[PDB]
UniProtKB/Swiss-Prot annotation, chain A:
This is Aminodeoxyfutalosine nucleosidase. GO terms for cellular component: cytosol. The active site is at Q13 (proton acceptor), D198 (proton donor). Its EC number is 3.2.2.30, 3.2.2.9. Belongs to the PNP/UDP phosphorylase family. Pfam families: PNP_UDP_1.
Length: 223, 225
């Protein structure tokens, strides 16, 4: 059978996903997290909220793989734009992700680099081409970019500009890079999608929750 | 096979062969998620040893695999740290009573620095493993200090950052993996003890030295478990 992981970066994204898929979902607790497991079109679907920041999101993804056997992972959520051409409500597919807060510069490593790893983590060529396929069939503009992730909420103009000079990043958030890393380590194809959320707010989040559930279901139908 | 199983993590790859050697039994190598796990039997326990790799995502991943894939019920975590206070000097051994993620910053939503929703600023380790470390250090006339340990994904070297960690968190030392391991163990219900040799206040001689010291200490703890 197929086994597919869907991770949401905000708790409010989860209900809209379960309801769109239509099938019953068993609630299953493991290590502080909650995993929703259902059958749709004869595939196992595992859905969960990541929780906040890199340790939380690493734990959730690691448990999704080792405990539920998911074979592919789809991670939606929200990011802040760092460049003018990226406007509120654009959908961005991450080709590369960087942990922006990593600094081993004292040992002569460049910023973002950990030994036995790399500065930029790649996502799955096949899932990304399918997202472009889904987006075209649905008349959505899907833009391509580098996402930066870290355990700070980045608001200041100075930190934003450093992220663009050093990593060539388009957008910023808190979980993406850790999730894509874990998937690489286990040889599990991953796709990370973000709707742009800044350049009064619940409405933006609600709607973006509804439309991401639709886009993910459409990727699953093709898988 | 045995009923009891214990995980032993090292924050430096240099710490592993001394540990494997001192326990003296045969270890089988099991690769998983980019990590290598050494599985052996000593006394009436299965022992699982692994290097954590560097920083918070690495170490969170290794611990989760150790708990989930090999069923460890207790975890002992050794490595090196930097001093933040004057009475903590090179070659001291320190037990972390509590741990904090010093780099977390959600102050834009009015959260105290270090706090993440659904968690706490301070993560706790095992009172009973810590009192055991203390009993062992008495028996062998070894110095074991007790303190708060700060972790984050930057090698901290400036005076401004060191003084923020003291004033904000009352930390006594700083390193890059402790808080994340104590956090995961907490999430699964697994008692955890974190032990650090102080590396500051040549580097390699200090390392080969401390790896021997800490492997003896770790084995002294298991012989009493």
């Amino acid at each position: 059978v197929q086994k597919i992981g869907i991770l949401g970066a905000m708790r409010e994204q989860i209900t809209p996903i379960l309801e769109l898929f239509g099938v019953d979902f068993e609630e299953i607790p493991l290590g502080g997290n909650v995993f929703h497991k259902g059958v749709y079109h004869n595939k196992e679907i595992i859905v969960a909220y990541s929780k906040i920041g890199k340790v939380h999101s690493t734990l959730t993804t690691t448990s999704m793989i080792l405990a539920f056997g998911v074979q592919k992972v789809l991670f939606s959520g929200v990011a802040g734009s760092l460049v003018k051409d990226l406007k509120i409500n654009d959908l961005l597919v991450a080709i590369q992700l960087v942990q922006h807060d990593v600094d081993l510069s004292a040992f002569d490593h460049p910023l973002g680099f950990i030994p036995e790893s790399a500065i930029f983590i790649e996502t799955s060529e096949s899932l990304n081409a399918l997202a472009k396929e889904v987006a075209n069939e649905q008349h959505i503009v899907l833009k391509e970019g580098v996402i930066a992730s870290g355990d700070q909420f980045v608001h200041s103009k100075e930190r934003k500009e450093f992220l663009v000079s050093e990593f060539k990043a388009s957008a910023v958030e808190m979980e993406g890079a850790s999730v894509a890393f874990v998937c690489q380590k286990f040889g599990v194809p991953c796709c990370v999608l973000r709707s742009i959320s800044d350049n009064s707010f619940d409405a933006f989040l609600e709607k973006s929750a509804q439309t991401s559930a639709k886009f993910l279901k459409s990727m699953v139908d093709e898988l």
